[PDB]
Write a structure and sequence with these properties.
One of its GO terms (molecular function) is heme binding. The protein is an alpha+beta fold. The protein has 15 helices and 14 strands. The structure holds protoporphyrin IX containing FE and potassium ion.
Length: 405
């Protein structure tokens, strides 16, 4: 259950937070993680759960640690330790300076330019998907939109057949929110098994998809290996198969329970981008960490070489020391401060594709289905992990109140 407290960790800084099953999970994931920012919780605590590790609970500690890659390496960014040791995706598991040459190549396949090309296809799928649901007066948001909308776009960018989705979605899920059926190492191996033949095929007959680009690309001049390409594609898959999907559910869940917020975006649609950003703050969902490369005293606390430290990207924006009334959603918030797409040299390369997908969704959905509620009596369940998510979101609505385009 609880790993014995290392001799160097102070007894008074112990807070046994379980990142995969947080005590207040019923109150909502963010609410569950926010218990870390309650009155008597220190800036940095040690939890004996999951092998034991440090956890920065406030924004400036989280931001500072992400900026200092010399002390907080991404070498072992996953918890538990054995998962963080198996974690070898590129560029996610590399620290500057070597990280840069690989990050540039990845930025070329999912970057802004790529997003602009993909826009019209993103809108079609959004509308196509929404219009088909419109008349039914109901849906299971997670499997009827949250998943297919962003995943099909990714599989399109990657040039992978949609039939592989069930298998890939399962693998990435086990990496972020393991249900126990398989370890991170096992899921990685299976993911690599999937990619190997694809990378070599795409490398023989070069296409124009993200995978072909990576497999045939160069890192600051020299040719990328078949292995480096495999570790890079893994990162891209992990990144765009699990993230946007779960976030869309947090947003739509909130919108379903908040008609005043819905009508605001209805009457004033130009504020949608702003709402997108505020929503990304309030419903941030990623939380991974770093490993100490040497003994180091951080904020009056002695950290030992090898110690793992969870730096919850999610907690920064929920930090009342960053945003007043952090748990309150305000589309007009003056300065939306957050680290939802990370901080430092590993800033999310897919943030632009993510924002686009979120904004297009808000627009097209409210345009066709402005009024909708959560199925009556439905107890919504969140799941916690490296990436938190929503188990299911049943939505209902009167078709008579909808409008086709
Ligand atoms: C709501 C959507 C998303 C959120 C909140 C998000 C969040 C994050 C975070 C917090 C990190 C930093 C991890 C660290 O520092 O260890 C990250 C990295 C990354 N994400 Fe995103 N992500 C999202 C969507 C995506 C998508 C759709 C893609 C694929 C197109 C993607 C690709 C990546 C990549 C490749 C990295 C690694 C960057 C590096 O290591 O330099 N992400 N993301
Ligand atoms: K590793």
């Amino acid at each position: 259950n609880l790993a014995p407290l290392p001799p160097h960790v102070p007894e008074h800084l112990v807070f046994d937070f379980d990142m995969y099953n947080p005590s207040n999970l019923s109150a909502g994931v963010q609410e569950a993680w926010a218990v870390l920012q309650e009155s008597n919780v220190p800036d940095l605590v040690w939890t004996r759960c999951n092998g034991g590790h440090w956890i920065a609970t406030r924004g400036q500690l989280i931001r500072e640690a992400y900026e200092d890659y010399r002390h907080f390496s991404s070498e072992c960014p996953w918890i538990p330790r054995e998962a963080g040791e198996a974690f070898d995706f590129i560029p996610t598991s590399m620290d500057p300076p070597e990280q840069r040459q690989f990050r540039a190549l990845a930025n070329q396949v999912v970057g802004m330019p790529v997003v602009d090309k993909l826009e019209n296809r993103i809108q079609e799928l959004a509308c196509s998907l929404i219009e088909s649901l419109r008349p039914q007066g109901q849906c299971n948001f997670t499997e009827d939109y949250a998943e297919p909308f962003p995943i099909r776009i990714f599989m399109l960018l990657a040039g992978l057949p949609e039939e592989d989705i069930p298998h890939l979605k399962y693998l990435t899920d086990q990496m972020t929110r393991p249900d126990g059926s398989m370890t991170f190492a096992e899921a990685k191996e299976a993911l690599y098994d999937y990619l190997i033949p694809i990378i070599e095929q795409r490398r023989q007959k070069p296409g124009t998809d993200a995978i072909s680009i990576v497999a045939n690309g160069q890192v600051n001049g020299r040719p990328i290996t078949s292995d480096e390409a495999k570790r890079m594609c893994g990162a891209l898959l992990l990144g765009g198969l699990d993230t946007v999907v779960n976030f869309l559910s947090f947003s739509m869940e909130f919108l379903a329970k908040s008609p005043e917020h819905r009508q605001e975006l209805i009457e004033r649609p130009e504020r949608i981008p702003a709402a997108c950003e505020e929503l990304l703050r309030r419903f941030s969902l990623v939380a991974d960490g770093r490993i100490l490369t040497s003994d180091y005293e951080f904020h009056g606390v002695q950290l030992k070489k090898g110690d793992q430290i969870l730096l919850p990207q999610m907690l920064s924006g929920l930090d009342e020391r960053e945003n007043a009334a952090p748990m309150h959603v305000d589309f007009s918030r003056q300065k939306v401060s957050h680290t939802t797409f990370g901080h430092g040299s590993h800033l999310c390369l897919g943030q632009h594709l993510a924002r686009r997908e979120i904004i297009v969704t808000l627009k097209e959905w409210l345009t066709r289905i402005p009024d909708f509620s959560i199925a009556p009596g439905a107890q919504i369940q969140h799941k916690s992990g490296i990436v938190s998510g929503v188990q299911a979101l049943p939505l209902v609505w009167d078709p008579a109140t909808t409008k086709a385009v």
